[model samples]
Each structure stands twice: as C-alpha cells, then as structure tokens.
Target: GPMDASVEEEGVRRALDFAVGEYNKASNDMYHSRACQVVRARKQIVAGVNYFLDVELCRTTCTKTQLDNCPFHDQPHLKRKAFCSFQIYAVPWQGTMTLSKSTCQDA
Candidate 1:
C-alpha cells in the first residue's frame, strides 16, 4: 500500500515548518546568552524586561536588605536551575520574603 499520507497535508507541513523555525530561533538566542544574562521568550519577555529594570532600580535605590525571604521557603519549596543563564536558584516570592542570605533556600 502506498499509504495515502494526506492527513491535512498543508496544515501538517505548516506546523512542522513553524516548529523548526521556532527551534532555530531558540538556538540562536541561546548562543548569545554567554555574554548576556537576560533571556526573553514570547510568553515572558515583557515580564522579564520589567524584572530586570526593577531589579536595577532596587539595586540603585537601597543599600540595605528589603523584605525578608517569603515565609513559604521556611517549609516546602522548589528549586529551579538555569539552563543557559546563571541562576543559582529561584525561590517563590513568598519564600524569598522570609530567609536571609545566610538561611536562604538553595536551588
């Protein structure tokens, strides 16, 4: 049997091409992350940009520590690692509000 592979041929090809393009773009951006610390994706780009700006502003504004690590870290928590960026860990805002650096949860 010649297997009539007409399973929405046009849509399938379009989807496949889109996925390939997306992967290529992601790979290119990944290469630039060596000298850069920021990575932006379609879903989180704006938030990531704002976070960087806000972090900078916070750094420039205060010489002392602000909120204590969120109370959540005192109990159960999650550890997130960076793939291409330099992230030691990412704690929830709640957890970050409670622990001091000496006691901060390690990812």
Candidate 2:
C-alpha cells in the first residue's frame, strides 16, 4: 500500500480547516487564527488516515465565536503571520478528525 503521497486539494483543505479550528480551541490567545495557505501536505494511510501539513497562517480579527464569516486584521502593521505544522488523523468511518498535534510560531 502507498505509505505517503501529496494530498488532494479538498482533502488537504479539509484537514487544514479542521486543524485551524482545533488550534484555536487549544490556544491561549484571545483571537482565532486562520490558515492563509497550505505550504505542504502529505497523506498517509494508516489504520485510517493521517495528514501532515505545513500551513501559512494569520491571526485574524475573528474571535472564537466569529471564526466564520470574518476577515483578517485590517491594520497594516499587525501582520500576525505564522508558519504552522499540523498532524491530523481521521477515521473515515467515524467521520471525525482528531488533532494529533499542532505547532505554530512567528513567520
């Protein structure tokens, strides 16, 4: 079986989205962050599936409740950009994602 391969757009996007959500929930920061782009992604089929990704992220103006339908910061100096790495696991049959781990730091 294939051990690792580049992920499809939608699949990686889904993992990125779920990762960001979990990241925000786990963070001590007041505002939530959003993934600006997927820098790299790899999908590995284990007993279920595993997604390893590096994402360009930004601290958005949205709060936890406003994570959706909100935009990034409007101020120019508040770049708040970062590089984030994520490991997400999913069981397709369970239709749920687990945030194995996530790390983020200034870009």
Give the alpha carbon lDDT tens digit for every residue of 1-107 in model 1.
11222213442233223332333344422221111112221111221211110000001121122331222111222211122211111133323211111111122
lDDT of 2: 0.78
**Candidate 2, position 56, lDDT:** 82
Clashing pairs in 2: none
Error of 1 at 68 (Å): 53
Model 2 weakest 10-residue run by lDDT? 1-10
State every prediction's TM-score relative to the real structure. 0.21, 0.79
Displacement of residue 44 (Cα, Å) in model 1 is 27
lDDT of 2 by residue, 1-67 (tens): 3344454657677887899878877888787877777788888888888889988877777667632
